[model samples]
Target: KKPTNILWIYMEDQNPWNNAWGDYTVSTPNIKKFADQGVRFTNAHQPAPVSSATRSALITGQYQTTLGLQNHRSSRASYNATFLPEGYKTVPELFVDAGYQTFNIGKDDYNFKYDRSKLYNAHEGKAGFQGAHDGTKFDWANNLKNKPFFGQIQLKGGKHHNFNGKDVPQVDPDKMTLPAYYADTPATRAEWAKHYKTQVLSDIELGQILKELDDNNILENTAIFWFSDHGMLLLRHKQELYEDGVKVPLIISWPAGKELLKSKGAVRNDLISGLDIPATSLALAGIDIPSYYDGKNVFSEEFSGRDYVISAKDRMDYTFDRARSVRTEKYRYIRQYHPELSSAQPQYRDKKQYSIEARALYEEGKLTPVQAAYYSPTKPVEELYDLQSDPDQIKNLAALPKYKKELLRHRQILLDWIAKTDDKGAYPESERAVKEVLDIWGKNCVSTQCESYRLHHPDSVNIPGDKVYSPIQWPAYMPKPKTPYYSEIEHIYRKKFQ
Candidate 1:
């Protein structure tokens, strides 16, 4: 039996804002069309919020915590490349081994530059807007000579700047849904309006791929999976460990995939992680998934479901932070390793648009106390939320008297997961290490000199990126304390323990 030809459409910096998710604020007709053709997951999440960590987990069916690939923008400057177990292989490699031609078009920034020697048969970066069309170097598939191929097309999604000169459509910013933390200011509204336009553009981009597949007449054979890296592109959404940061849209559409969509009524309520895709793909291809892989084959007849999924956050570029999260169907718990660290670290050079806008509001003394709290100096070590009651996570119930039991239960769950998964976010990156990272980017304006960063040996663990920072590294203070920590929760914990 010939295996299904896999077509994964990985979108950038997006969430479940499509019409498929019943979102009325944005325009994404093609995505809704795609959803109708297959299974849509309402609770699909990224294992990590940032690019590198989530991408690494997505490709390997393993958590970044397990692979020492937890940190974002890692393996450059003061960081070293994350290593994998001997004989371990990427998901695409498994496809290739199963006699499939695997190709990746654009966006494979998986923290470390994977030794692509064995993975993709025809890996290439995506061309600009006009160029990436027309079958994506049709030669790559023709060379397959009818061999089933696993193709990945990366969509920029909401991240793309230009809207192809199309006049922005009229969407009322006030009508658009916003998080409790965000101020409904004109700038914020404008930014969100612009984002909706980007969503339309994303649909256009996806339509182009659909056209390419139709032009090539491969729609009958290709299994299409459409999903984004993480959630939306707002201040708290993109990087934070909240629901908006990690929850993403997932649609699995294929010509012959209706059988697989039977249990799910075109929409699945079960919790899933992007990490699950690798194992599912392997299972679909009739390949044996490695026992070490943490992902589950959702298609397996024995598969029941996941009760909870975890997401983590570490340093993002220059802003250093450590946080982990666990989400059940009705509840969410977040634990910040650095209790003193504020969620509102000033934007690292136009990195986050909404953060900058909110910061501006803070300086002008125009924002309400609730909206202004986003720019607070520090935060609590633990945050618990009843998603059923407060989906936006504005009200933190971690310290509430009645929720203690629930808080402790979720807290222990997170702790157990961190211990079992070896979550590297239990510790903070040292000041010296991150300082050098900034300096490296500062000095090397010509090109990245950090690619050569690789671990020398197991003994050289203290070096940045050389080792996974975990519970043991807790209290591993920086050479010079640079950032502020909140005193209420941070001080109590630091005093009673460290």
Candidate 2:
């Protein structure tokens, strides 16, 4: 018989806030039951914070930076000619080669060009897959065919609320406890309540998927992986390099390969990168993981857990910014390449209700200093937080004398990682790629600091190049922004908000 079928229940923009993770804000009975049947990972993280970059790394079992796919939604307009590196293959392609019927029934926002038919037997929706069947009425049991299969059921986790526009709010807005970094405004509380309500709806969807497997007699024969692509969709969570941005809940239940687990219903605090998902799934299927892959099977006997996990953020939409972070069990270190740009840089999410409310509070001088810092005109070049004491990451230890050693250590770790991985984000995105972004966003693109603006007005700004600094000496490199550019961006934001 073929190896156990692998089923990935992937969610979008979610964090570990369900009942399974000890957060009672939302009741997720289906996910909680699934967690009780498997091993729950407490320290799983995405290599990149956004959907496309993280998905790209997940599909390839490598860091997106290594493949020059670090920028969010890069190469889309130019995707007809763009391809994965020579001799490289996606995880689904590997599964197909090993005789698995592959299918994905929601989203596959990968940042490369490839033939979908070559990778999956069936798929749903049109973002990436072609000639797909109707996702709403997909026949998972029949289309999975006879062979062992690898399939994904994508759910809109934190991206939207009131699934199908019918969900009623089960969470009370007044009961929500927002982090200190966020203002405790009515709008913020309402948004948080909606987020919890969305989780409840996603749980219902999860229950349906599990029910289908059980009804088809496939539950006992399948290894299920339930996780999110990244963290929640709120500010300081989605595209930023904070714990809430990168940390995700991962629960693995393998009825067929239960023997591979040390103990069922166990909790694992060992660090796990999102890249490890493909490698671990391959290992569970009795397939060989590619030698060039950057990920390691966390369940393998030889798989020593990572000492630290790295997450990167680069060029999200038309906003050009770069930040790399190193996270261990107890601490987090972040190096921002564009310290001159604020964390509140104009972005697509600026239109969200919570964001607008937060900005208004900042303008009215009603927000606390800590809350206002998020919308500051500039950010620190480096930040270090002792996660044990500051899980919310409000305190910066980078400049503190007592934590200099820890700061230096994490700095060196990131430097070595960048060199080892040949991080392509160290260089500027190509002119062609920036042009595509400009063409798509056009006048709505507000960030003058972006490479798109630099391309059209060459003398107006200076952007860092590949040779800006040696990898080891990156810590000494300080970004110098043209103040006029920041003023222009601020003006654009004010006009939009007014």
Candidate 3:
């Protein structure tokens, strides 16, 4: 017997490309079945793109910027400088304190050095699907001490490459509909097809978990939430803060398809950020949300919807950059703190399969104007897109005469958001700011002593044993272009394509 249980299925490195979210070609029948009985959130999004950043926000119910946790993967010892504010606590800790037995069966890339003992009554550091049996680490029987429980079963959905020597089902490239930002190369198509195969594997794993829920007879009171951490892991998808990167799939079915779900079986189009998960979960458990959390409970009658949500990006695997975006229901506004750098600024992803293909295609001059936009050497400080007309987000509407009010509205909203949250990005990264992290890891301070660090401990700034640090070639400060960059590009696009 389960008492108000929360079953969280955390998906890794995926997007809303599942059939449940309207990508009809992809086969995710189990996910679709859950969506049929739950709240299918159409505008759900992670606050950031990369694993550590997005995870940090969800765990804390606070903006990563507000907590000064901007760096994607900082040294764990120094994570306090980047995570959880003085008075704030994590979501799991809240539940445990309220007498709920918590169990986590997989990953926690929370980007912070946390003591696990305080977070969970039981946690399997590594547990997921191997494609053999109906896999589950949630030992409900053992934890059933006549008390309530909150359990998480994280599936290794698409992270593992299961293709080396084994035989797996294949998806036809011709049937798959590609995202507009990607090139239509044979290599890209093949990679996309493989992605579908991974999704199929994920669906099978989910089906197994659902069967376990039914067999255990805990389906009556369990509130199940199935969602991906962020979007797809591909070029301009995972690390970047475009629509595809930040957008995610969120399906919530509570009371096991009983009165709760029966009363509200609908596709919710209201804007909801991953930041709201902590508050919503607590509220669902009949616990009061802490005053420190920034998220709002979706089920609360006081909750209407958000006017806009912010998406941010920062350093990831030796790629030093900063960008933020404000997305509303109809428009997306992006502001690159470092506008002079290219979107293809050398990062670890450049070595990945699809990244290699896209870069090579652009270098060969085979990409069309839509695809060529990715390879730009410089960028506009601000970019505005009208999602209503151009869902692909190729056309820049920032400088268009008719969109002046909309552009300015979003710009002010972001400025206010940063001010309200005390965003650390408002003051860019410097030696003083990152001194704690640098001192902890025994690395060079990039702001003040970069030259000496470069000469003496070169490998400290790069992957150990590498000769040169890539950012050493960059200018001391990134210059925001004096010209109207995206406006000029928009004019050219209209002239060429329209």
Model 2: how far residue 456 lies from native, Å: 4.0
Query: For each candidate, what is the lDDT?
Result: 0.68, 0.76, 0.68
Which candidate wins on TM-score? Answer: 2
The TM-score that candidate 3 achieves is 0.82
- What TM-score, to 2 decimals, does candidate 2 have? 0.87
The true-versus-predicted C-alpha distance at residue 8 of model 1, in Å, is 1.0
Candidate 1, residue 496: Cα displacement in angstroms equals: 44
Which predicted model would earn the best lDDT? Answer: 2
Model 2 CA deviation exceeding 4 Å by range: 1-3, 78-81, 123-137, 163-169, 449-498
Regions of model 1 farther than 4 Å from truth? 1-3, 77-79, 124-145, 165-168, 172-177, 349-353, 427-436, 439-498
**Candidates sorted by TM-score, best first:** 2, 3, 1
Put down candidate 1 lDDT per residue, 351-445, tens digits, no spaces. 44555667777889998777876777788889899999998788899989999998888888887887887776665554334433433343221
lDDT of 3 by residue, 117-199 (tens): 55676543331111001122566634553467777777765575775533356578876677777888776787778777777
In model 2, the Cα lDDT at residue 343 comes to 93
- What's the lDDT of the predicted structure labeled candidate 3? 0.68
Provide the lDDT at 257 for model 2: 58
